[PDB]
């Protein structure tokens, strides 16, 4: 049916809307960090990616785990695509006022992420002690810093570069929303800046393109009809589908944390699948609140087709396959397929 999914969705909203001092603990820590990074040569133009929002939650099950982004406006950037990866880039500068605020991190002509991250970490490490806050150092690149307030509160900090120039060539054929959100909206969205986060593909001074802000924007204005979800008549189940798929992967990832099979999968994989189903189903009538279950099943069916065909194109970079053999091995994909197919056929036990 579509009854139980609603109760999952009610439990999820009640935790989310519940009164907690958590966001206030987070707010004080980040405002203090931002004030200390600003009175420093390299990070004087630092700020929160989305102001007003400190309470950003990636894990839809964990109301105690926060994720924050620190954007840095980098003017006159030159990017070089690393090893034809389409999403991984070197950072160079057009060079006009040569003694630019980030010249101190230049390793030759290429901008060192590691050098920039070390200073960012060193500035934060020295401000935590000054404050109940403690930091942990975790590999990968970004999140750079991870903070722990009290016992349950956890905060991931990601350093990002902001570029107000045109999106790289690898995105040219991406964001295929023309028949859903319109060609007018695509051009507007693509006029918006883009972010680079420190990341590699297994170790160089590379940066991955990030479009968190586009995702947030589309989600808060997701209909073909401009009035979608504003009234009683136009209530769609798009966000509810996204939430249920996110919960599904989070529940399976917890259920199988002892084994390492679902370690490569994340919300990126679940978000990208949903957005591809949004393109496939552009009409609001295809997302009626009465069809929750049928709608959710088409999301689960598409994701299942992606795992099996080993194909999940990045929504912005269509040549980047999230499900490639070098990214995720067949063994890990087949383990996930079987786990979901059992969930589909047993009235999703994880959701109770
Ligand atoms: C709306 C669709 C979801 C979405 C949100 C967002 O914020 N972004 N930002 C990018 N940028 C390129 C990019 C390329 C690859 C990976 C990746 C992920 C996992 C494993 C291995 C690689 C992550 C980012 N794509 C997205 N898609
Ligand atoms: Zn809607």
Any residues with CB less than 8 A from the CB of 278 and at least 6 apart, and which? 177, 180, 222, 238
- Same domain assignment for residues 225 and 282: yes
DSSP string, 215-231: HHHHHTT--SSTTTTSS
Pairing relation of β-strands 106-107 and 110-111?
antiparallel
Residue 47 and residue 180 share a domain: no
Question: Which alpha helices (DSSP H) does the chain contain, by range?
Answer: 4-17, 22-38, 113-128, 183-189, 212-219, 238-255, 267-280, 292-309, 330-345
Query: By alpha-carbon position, which residue is closest to atom 21 of ligand 1?
Result: 322
Ligand 1: which of 177, 316, 321, 326 to mutate, most ligand atoms within 8 Å of CB?
Answer: 316
Six-digit token string for 245: 């798929």
Sign of the CA dihedral running 149, 155, 156, 160: negative
Under 8 Å between Cβ of 160 and 70: yes
Number of domains in the chain: 2
Query: Using alpha carbons only, how large is the chain's radius of gyration in Å?
Result: 21
Per-residue exposure over 97-121, b if at least 16 CB sit within 10 Å of its own CB, e if not = eeebbbeebbeeebbbbebbbebbb
Same domain, 100 and 138: yes
Task: Kindly tell me the burial class for residue 201, based on how many C-beta atoms sit within 10 Å of its own C-beta (0-12, 13-18, 19 or more).
Answer: middle
The protein residue with its alpha carbon nearest to ligand 1, atom 7, reads: 212
Q: Taking a C-beta distance cutoff of 8 angstroms, is the pair 154, 142 a contact?
A: no
The answer to whether residues 107 and 229 touch, using CB atoms and an 8 Å cutoff, is no
Distance CA(150)–CA(90), nearest Å, equals 38
Angle, helix 238-255 to helix 212-219, in steps of 10 degrees? 130
Q: Which domain holds residue 70?
A: 15-166+194-210
Asked whether 210 lines ligand 1 (CB < 6 A), one says yes
Residue tagged 């994701």 (tokens): 303
271 lines ligand 1 (CB under 6 A): yes
The last residues before gaps in the chain (C-N over 2.5 Å) are 131, 202
Token reading at 83: 């090893």
Q: Answer positive or negative: Cα dihedral of 335, 310, 211, 186.
A: negative
Q: Which of 92, 94, 124, 139 shows the shortest CA–CA distance to 111? A: 92
For residues 142 and 24, membership in a common domain is answered with yes
Q: Round to whole Å and give the CA distance between 181 and 271.
A: 17
Give yes or no: residues 334 and 226 share one domain. Answer: yes
Nearest to 289 by CA among 16, 3, 13: 3
Q: Are residues 225 and 149 in the same domain?
A: no
Mutation choice for ligand 1 from 197, 264, 268, 315, CB with most ligand atoms inside 8 A:
268
Both 203 and 132 in a single domain?
Answer: yes
If phi > 0 it is left, if psi is from -120 to 50 it is alpha, else beta; for residue 95 that is: left
Domain boundary among 210, 236, 268: 210
The upper half-sphere exposure of residue 164, i.e. CA atoms within 13 Å in the direction of its Cβ, equals 6
- Bridge partners, residue 154, by sequence: 65, 148
Could you give the dihedral angle defined by the CA atoms of residues 94, 98, 99 and 105, in that order, rounded to the nearest 10 degrees?
Answer: 50
Spatial separation of the C-alpha atoms in residues 215 and 212, rounded to whole Å: 5
Q: Are residues 152 and 176 in the same domain?
A: no
Give the pairing type, strands 153-163 and 65-73.
Answer: parallel
Closest among 210, 180, 203 to 83, alpha carbons compared: 203
CA atoms 123, 88, 66, 174: torsion sign = positive
Resolution of the PDB structure in angstroms:
2.3
Same domain? For 116 and 127 the reply is yes
Question: How many A from CA of 233 to the centre of ligand 1?
Answer: 34
Examine the domain organization and report whether 162 and 178 are in the same domain: no
Helices 292-309, 238-255: axis angle to 10 degrees equals 50
For the chain, the distance separating the N- and C-terminal CA atoms, rounded to the nearest angstrom, is: 14
Encoding tokens for residue 99? Answer: 């003694």
Element (H, E) at 88: strand 88-93
Q: Note whether 107 and 171 are same-domain residues.
A: no
**Are residues 184 and 224 in contact, defined by beta-carbon separation less than 8 angstroms?**
no
Question: Looking at the structure, do residues 152 and 173 belong to the same domain, yes or no?
Answer: no
Q: Could you give the CA distance from residue 305 to residue 310 in angstroms, rounded to a whole number?
A: 8
Given 210, 245, 274, the domain boundary residue is 210
Q: Is the peptide bond before 78 cis (omega within 30 degrees of 0)?
A: no
Among 177, 210, 243, the domain-final residue is 210
Picking from 202, 201, 213, the residue whose alpha carbon sits closest to that of residue 81 is 201
- C-alpha dihedral sign at 77, 81, 85, 86: positive
Check if the beta carbon of residue 315 is closer than 8 Å to that of residue 276. Answer: yes
* Ligand 1 close to Cβ of residue 209 (< 6 A): yes
């Amino acid at each position: 049916g579509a009854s139980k999914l609603r109760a999952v969705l009610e439990k999820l909203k009640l935790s989310r809307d519940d009164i907690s001092t958590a966001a206030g603990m987070v707010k004080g820590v980040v405002d203090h960090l931002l004030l200390r990074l600003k009175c420093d040569s390299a990070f004087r133009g630092v700020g929160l990616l989305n102001t007003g929002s400190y309470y950003e939650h990636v894990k839809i099950s964990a109301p105690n785990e926060f994720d924050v982004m620190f954007k840095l406006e980098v003017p006159r950037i030159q990017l070089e695509e690393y090893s034809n990866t389409r999403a991984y880039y070197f950072v160079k500068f057009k060079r006009n006022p040569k003694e630019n605020p980030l010249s101190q991190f230049l390793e030759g002509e290429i901008l060192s992420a590691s050098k920039m991250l070390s200073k960012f970490r060193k500035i934060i490490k020295e401000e935590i002690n000054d404050i109940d806050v403690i930091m942990k150092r975790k590999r990968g690149g970004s999140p750079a810093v991870t903070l722990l307030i009290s016992e349950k509160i956890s905060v991931d900090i990601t350093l990002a570069l902001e570029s107000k120039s045109s999106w790289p060539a690898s995105t040219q054929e991406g964001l295929r929303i023309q028949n859903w959100l319109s060609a007018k909206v695509r051009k507007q969205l693509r006029l918006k800046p883009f972010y680079l986060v420190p990341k590699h593909a297994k170790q160089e001074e590379t940066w991955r393109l990030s479009f968190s802000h586009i995702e947030k924007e589309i989600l808060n204005n997701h209909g073909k009809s401009k009035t979608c979800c504003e009234n009683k008549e136009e209530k769609c189940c798009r966000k509810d589908c996204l939430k249920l798929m996110k919960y599904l992967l989070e529940q399976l990832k917890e259920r199988f944390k002892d084994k390492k099979h679902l370690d490569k999968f994340s919300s990126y994989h679940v978000k990208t699948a949903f957005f591809h189903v949004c393109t496939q189903n552009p009409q609001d009538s295809q997302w009626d609140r009465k069809d929750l279950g049928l709608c959710f099943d088409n999301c689960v069916t598409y994701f299942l087709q992606c795992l099996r065909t080993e194909k999940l194109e990045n929504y912005f970079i269509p040549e980047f396959n999230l499900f490639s053999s070098n990214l995720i091995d067949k063994r890990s994909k087949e383990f996930l397929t079987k786990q979901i197919e059992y969930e589909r056929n047993n009235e999703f036990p994880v959701f109770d």
